[PDB]
A paper describes a structure:
Calcium homeostasis modulators (CALHMs/CLHMs) comprise a family of pore‐forming protein complexes assembling into voltage‐gated, Ca2+‐sensitive, nonselective channels. In these cells, CeCLHM1 forms a Ca2+‐sensitive ion channel involved in regulating the function of excitable cells and maintaining normal motility of the worms.
The transmembrane region of the channel structure of the dominant class shows an assembly of 10‐fold rotational symmetry in one layer, and its cytoplasmic region is involved in additional twofold symmetrical packing in a tail‐to‐tail manner. the doubled‐layered channel of CeCLHM1 is formed by docking the C‐terminal domains (CTDs) from two decameric hemichannels in a tail‐to‐tail manner. The channel contains a wide funnel‐like pore with a diameter of approximately 40 Å around the narrowest central region, and over 60 Å around the extracellular and intracellular entrance. S0 and S1 are tightly packed against the outer wall, shaping a widely open pore at the central region of the channel, and the lumen surface of the pore exhibits alternating layers of positive and negative charges.
Author numbering:
A (entry chain S), B (entry chain T), C (entry chain R): 1 to 260, 278 to 312
D (entry chain G): 278 to 312
């Protein structure tokens, strides 16, 4: 199933080079799927225990989701433009409660793209979901008794049998390997939960990013121009900041080997803005407010 | 069947580099078919259950169709030019009810190219359709009884046989693997449904895109010039918007390190227009209406 | 498990080329993981002794952590800017007690990135943690008696058996290889401790580097400009120092084959500074204080 | 450019400050604080 999902990686590399909502993290998601298909070639360590099988399945599922959710927050620039130095903002430059929640849900969804994709990848594998209800099916309270004292584990594996003892309640190696009828049943149960999660996330994400492209105040040419102007001023401003710091570092380095902007400007110079005026991306709005009235 | 359909992918790469209706998504469709032939090299997980086999077949068929239909909507530009910010259009700039349905059916067909192609690819495989009426043939109500309690599954697989028990009503492994006579019969049943769907879609699509190239008001040289002018102004306008935002970001970045267009224009600047006048693609029609009378 | 974690190395090479806190050591960490996956292909020497198994496991875990912690200190520049020549600083140029602890915790966390990653890599292997409680499970006080005199080791391996003698308290080869039920149990115990450590470190590191990006005085554009100015003056100052020493070495080399700056400046020229004034990175603050008043 | 800028942009000035020729003095007073 590795080369199949790698071909799917090439397909959605073509997708994340075509379009989407944004594309700041489309490089990393396809590399995660294309590398962790080959990880899933060597997985399901899948212990033979009552609590540790649920732990090794539940942690291994809902752990990298939280990890990639945290990475999708922290790498995403806009949340830092919301909350880089939230304590020491000069007052009334932090903007609102309603708009900051819209930006918060924006960065949450742009973050949560990648963990939903990873969850769909592993649920789409016949993997750690069989390692979950392979436990939860096996009637395992006698293996609680078997692991109260490991002498019972030894004499349940060796003296009494394992699959001949499939009558009552079971001790371990049903856990690490089930019946292949049960294994295939629960494997495709994982496949249908995988596609149900993917289709639910796709429909809900389509509906949300449509309802924030259909309730958008600006319209499609005006929105493409605001996005082009945003994407050019947050590069041209950085190029001018770099050459300004480079000249003032040139002169201050020459200043040493020849011996022998208030917070209001640096805070109106920061986005997560209102889009209610003809000017926007509040470098413009600061510039209209204070000096240098027009360019 | 993988390299065969990959050769078909190369053939229809030549086709989608020759002609068609449009070619904005012809790159991705051939990559989907050429990668998911190799996906179909490793498929039919195909569970041994009464409801889950129909679920794992029906979801796996009609799920990626809806997913690629949603992708074919959202990637396609024209529907956003219909409905990017449909709430906050300045009134009477949204145009009609009849013309917007023509554009809606246009983006629906240009979307639905790729799911019909994917449906034909998987039906053309002997795949998840055998995984559908392999269930629906097998007389499976005794497997409902077998999966009311999995002890009956165990003693139907082990104690009683599976293919020696082909007399009455069946319990699982008929489901996961049928008789090869039945399998080949139902496989080519899937092949003839595949080609029936493809030929029906091809005839209907030919008839529709002919009846919207034969009921077209403009004629073939005038239509090729309107398409060339559209395809050059929605690139030249973006180049001028980029260099305009670049100059006004240059000057506004220099404006900060030296301290120490109403909605009517941005809405008549948007397509999904009437083609009833000598001017068209309503940047021209706006320009004829308001200032800068001729170029 | 080698190529899997090498694919993870490629993924987090993409991560450490995207973003983070800093990236001065992101080259070396991925090379450590990608090379020591292939080291872990040939590991668990794992002796058959009572004290030496715990020693060979505990030293091999908590040794390279201390080694990479020491390397992460010494390679990191900022701690030397705190304490290169701490004895012979001219007095009141060493700054405070509170701020130097903030820089100390900064260099401790930037150091401790790599040992936590290495600890997670080896705990994520089924490795030297099975080589720890494979000892601690095996009831080994009879192997203390067996290694009080190695004649008992010889007659415990040869005359009496090893796995037939799994009744009471055990002598060696249980240690070097346990029961595979126990081995897989304790292996996935190591996996869940691995992910628990990784998730705890990730949540705590996110919370700390957020609480020192949310309690930051400057804000995100001002902080990016201070970081750009810092990253350009500690290169432009070095280029001017190099060409100044090159001219004064040119002239002093010509000065020999033609025969036949107090400590205050060199100490205010050093960082780990206060960020309380409009000027910062105290080359600027020195320059404002003493001569060459402005550039 | 209001009349205040076009009037502090005009000489016959005081020479009492470190800046002079009152384009400089206007520039120090109002925006564009230093060159």
């Amino acid at each position: 199933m590795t080369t199949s999902i790698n071909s799917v990686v090439t397909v959605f590399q073509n997708v994340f080079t075509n379009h989407g909502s944004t594309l700041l993290n489309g490089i990393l998601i396809a590399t995660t799927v294309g590398g962790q298909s080959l990880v899933r070639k060597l997985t399901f360590s899948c212990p033979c225990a009552y609590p540790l099988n649920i732990y090794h399945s539940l942690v291994f599922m809902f752990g990298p989701t939280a990890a990639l959710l945290l990475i999708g927050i922290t790498v995403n620039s806009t949340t830092w433009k919301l909350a880089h130095g939230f304590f020491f903002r000069v007052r009334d430059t932090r903007h609102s409660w309603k708009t900051t929640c819209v930006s918060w849900i924006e960065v949450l969804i742009q973050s949560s793209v990648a963990p939903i994709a990873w969850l769909f990848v592993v649920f789409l594998d016949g993997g750690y979901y069989r390692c979950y209800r392979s436990h939860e099916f096996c009637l395992i309270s006698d293996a609680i008794l078997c692991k109260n004292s490991t002498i019972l584990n030894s004499y349940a594996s060796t003296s009494s049998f394992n699959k001949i003892s499939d009558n009552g309640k079971y001790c371990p190696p049903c856990i690490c390997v089930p019946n292949p009828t049960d294994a295939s049943y629960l494997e495709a149960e994982s496949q249908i939960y995988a596609w149900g999660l993917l289709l639910f996330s796709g429909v809900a994400a389509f509906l949300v990013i449509t309802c924030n492209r259909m309730c958008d105040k600006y319209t499609l040419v005006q929105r493409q121009y605001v996005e082009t102007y945003k994407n050019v001023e947050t590069q041209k401003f950085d190029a001018v900041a770099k050459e300004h710091a480079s000249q003032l570092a040139e002169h201050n380095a020459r200043a040493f080997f020849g011996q022998k902007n208030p917070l209001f400007a640096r805070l109106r110079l920061i986005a997560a803005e209102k889009t209610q005026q003809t000017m926007y991306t509040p470098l413009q709005l600061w510039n209209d407010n204070k000096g240098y009235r027009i360019p």
